[model samples]
Target: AMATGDERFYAEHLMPTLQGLLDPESAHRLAVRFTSLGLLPRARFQDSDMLEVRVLGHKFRNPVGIAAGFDKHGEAVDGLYKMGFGFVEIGSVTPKPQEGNPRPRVFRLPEDQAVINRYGFNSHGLSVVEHRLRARQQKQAKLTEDGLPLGVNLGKNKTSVDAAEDYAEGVRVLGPLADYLVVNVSSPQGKAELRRLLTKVLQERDGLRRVHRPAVLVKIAPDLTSQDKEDIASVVKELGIDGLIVTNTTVSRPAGLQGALRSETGGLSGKPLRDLSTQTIREMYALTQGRVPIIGVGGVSSGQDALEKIRAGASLVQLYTALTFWGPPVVGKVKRELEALLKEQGFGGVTDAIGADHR
Candidate 1:
């Protein structure tokens, strides 16, 4: 609701008048609460084939997962699990707590069913998130079913002087607790120096390397040129990284969406990012020859979209903005639809569909 012209309607009734109660941080926490309590509505898919995917050194009951930036604190993993995510990644958490950007930093582009966020990796710091993860990891051990894997997306604080140290600190603090770790070098809200930070990360790779190495993955921007793609692929091969998340959002506006949300400053996500993300995934897949796994994200709102990424060589897939448009049930729906598409294509499972485009 536009706060200005729709005041009368918003003021009187809007399902819940909690906007007044929610700052971005509080709203985030509330969403976590809803998930934790299983208060958020859920749906069940009767098809047993829909569950079970093993990738990234972890096994998932379903291919669908809650992407990072949803639960930055790691306080609600159990709650999110109940909601049916096969895995959950939390944080872009930094070494210290930071407030992120000022108000109105997150804008919902309802017209396009998209979100433009300049959240700048706002987080509650590694200590708090790590503490929560430790607790959850222990709790997970007690569960009979294989617990959902949890990944920690680490980012440098906006004011950090040393980018490499920032990442190293995150690894130092949160690495032991994470099932996997993502070096998020692609949030568009950070200064261009953040991209430069990736170079620094490549240099100090050994400092962050551990016994398990924690399924290390790097998140890259979708705006890279072909040259950039090659350079990044080479780095991935050289570094022996586990995987690459084919995108973090785009700074470039595609032709059709130019006038739709042209002025929104920040990374663009959702339908508008579909083609660019897919192209990037395909190129990266071809360049890497499927040696390292790729997690396809961006503009995936359906089974076909997921299939496109899988065919393009993404071993796994994630969705975010689509949830806002279609609601939570979309996750299970997408998985079922993807399974149907796989069966129709005569593939026995998702793995058979991976990089089918190349073959």
Candidate 2:
């Protein structure tokens, strides 16, 4: 097929075609570079008062955000913010640069509309990403319309010996630059030092508040026991975390997955992950008594999905895998749909829809 068409045609035809032809990892890189150059189409964010959400003493224009791992190195923060996401989080950055897992680490399941990735926290490290973040901050200041808040997702190197100090190092560098910081515990291997890790990080966590002061949110996995959820709630309650990311991805494959890549090592995300992630959100909200802020992720591709997440106790929602299928237009589309859903449901705004099911 000839690669000739308008933006609408290219989005509907060419983008999907290119997605199939390019390997998952390569296509992801191509997207990063494309967005890096500001090549994406302009988006007019919806001006709906009903979509506003306030959490952690900050208000978001909308509750939709791009999850971390999409722009792992902070290459396209501007492009993603321009995509009409209420926010754009970047990086699974570590204190030091490290090449992640071996090639063919990312596999797309068109049959499933899901992805399994073992990218293993590949990153350009703190300094490079910090620079880009500062640039975004500068741009935020100069622009009349304040761009969406930028979050930095911090992680440990695969080879790191001490995970806590690794994250402390990340906070020491990027905390000042980030509008918020996500402690991406899901990506790092193992949970042996849970206590020491939390304690160690909290020591700096408090100290950092005196420095740059950004919300620190913990991101967990979908596959978790009730005990695990309790543990998460305890940590948030005990230490007073700023927020929680309900899920990262799942290690367990849901039954009836027809994708050949279902066996691929690493976490699974997208369509199949919806229920699990949303359930976790509901549980966490109940666990916290609907008090702590939660950024719900995993398997969200539509406005209704985002709304379901909100009703499940997510103060906000994010998407990435769907970008592979729906493209950037999905952000605005989801936002508009969400506003309409809120109005249809008799709610005044996004905050009213939050935890609606539990109430």
Candidate 3:
């Protein structure tokens, strides 16, 4: 008999049905509420001590992290941390509060074990989010030795009259506070601008980076040509930027997808994207000659998935859609499972597993 105290009870009785209890977005809100209010029992990062990973010039207790767009408002970061993720990412936040594209923008493709969202860059603006991050950092500074690192996914406002200026502003304001910063640019023009954008943005962020501020990365789209890979590696190698977040939610839909919601107009993510994203990491690694660290994302649901990304050339990995299916404990479980896989393969740790496929 699985008692309420048993791990089996939690997985069978709670996790499997957690998402079905409410509409997808509503369930997300409930989760954010439960987390922000500390209404949930957080799983500890007990396995973190062994998962030791360093990337972007900082040491992570583990490699699994929550991806951007989950905590769009920067709320509930502490809870996600306590949920056992090595790190927590907040926001696609912009310069001002703005309602995204329109209602009914997010859809669940349950049959395909995926989600499609055209939420745009809906955000509460930077000022509000910065307060939360600033407050949390202050508390963490006094309360503990750095067990987990916090990152801010800097986003652009759709209404921005100037793209470069927007990214520059994001860097100026959020760069100093974050352990690292990610430039979220998934636009067609987005990739091209990322080059000059980083230059001008960092120039503006010069004063801030003089302190603890450093390590700015870029998140690009999964759909790419060979030339695109070469261009990206060039920019990454030439720039003094810290790393690259290989691929974001993809626009191209693959074959064999199920469910009517699969037709939804937005970025598709989850199991369907796993192979494509992993392939992108490999190409980027080959192109860059493994010069920059990469954070693999898109459709990772298990420890095997994370390990595949690491072998594909990612130093770290992240997942957001999987949380929709696997529930909170998945974060820690993936690391634990990957740790076992590492030992089985005669590897000492995560770094040992990274880029193993390339060699």
Best by lDDT: 2
Model 1 TM-score on a 0 to 1 scale: 0.84
Task: Tell me how far the alpha carbon of residue 86 in candidate 3 is from the true structure, in angstroms, after superposition.
Answer: 0.3
Which consecutive 10 residues in model 3 have the weakest lDDT in total?
1-10
lDDT of 3 by residue, 232-286 (tens): 7887788776788877888888999986888889999999999999999999889
Q: What tens-digit string does per-residue lDDT give for candidate 1 at 217-317?
A: 88888987666677677767866777888778888766655334467788888888887888889999999988988888898988899999999988888
Model 2 TM-score? 0.92
- Candidate 2 local lDDT, residue 141: 40
Estimate every model's Cα lDDT from 0 to 1.
0.73, 0.82, 0.79
Model 3 residue pairs with clashes: none
Order candidates by lDDT, high to low: 2, 3, 1
lDDT score of residue 182 within candidate 3: 83
> What lDDT tens digits, residue by residue, belong to model 2 across residues 1-359?
12112335645787689987999888899889888888876656545878777776566778898999999998887787777788878888988899998898998887898999999889999988878777667685433135367788999988888878898898788877776788865422234356557666667756775536677888989877777778778767777888899889899999978898899998899999999999999999999998899999999977799999999999999999888877767777778778888989999999888999997
| Residue pairs in candidate 1 whose N, alpha carbon or C atoms collide under 3 angstroms | 36-79, 52-61
